[PDB]
Amino acid sequence: VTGGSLNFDVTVGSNTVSLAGVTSTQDLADQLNSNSSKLGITASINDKG
Amino acid sequence: VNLVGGGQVKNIAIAAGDSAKAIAEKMDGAIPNLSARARTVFTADVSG
């Protein structure tokens, strides 16, 4: 990420995610794991990356 | 460097400068049921 982060959204069916500040895979991973309540889609980040 | 086993050849990328820990981390994983530890043990003895 050159000078900033990826402030994007995710619309899974009806509801729409409003995540922000994505610089690495881990960041998006935490954003999904937190939003697990709203979005009924489990995420997983292994040691691989 | 390439890996052989269980029909899963994978050219592990070892850049110029990567420490032993990084090498161990990279070579870990892809090849099934294989592990890779790292260890740097070095002594020292000051002369006159």
Swiss-Prot record, chain B:
Post-translational modification: Phosphorylated on tyrosine residue(s).
Domain of life of the source: Bacteria
Cellular compartment(s): Secreted; Bacterial flagellum
UniProt feature coiled coil, ranges: none
Similarity annotation: Belongs to the bacterial flagellin family.
Role summary: Flagellin is the subunit protein which polymerizes to form the filaments of bacterial flagella.
Protein name as it appears in the record: B-type flagellin
Gene name of the record: fliC
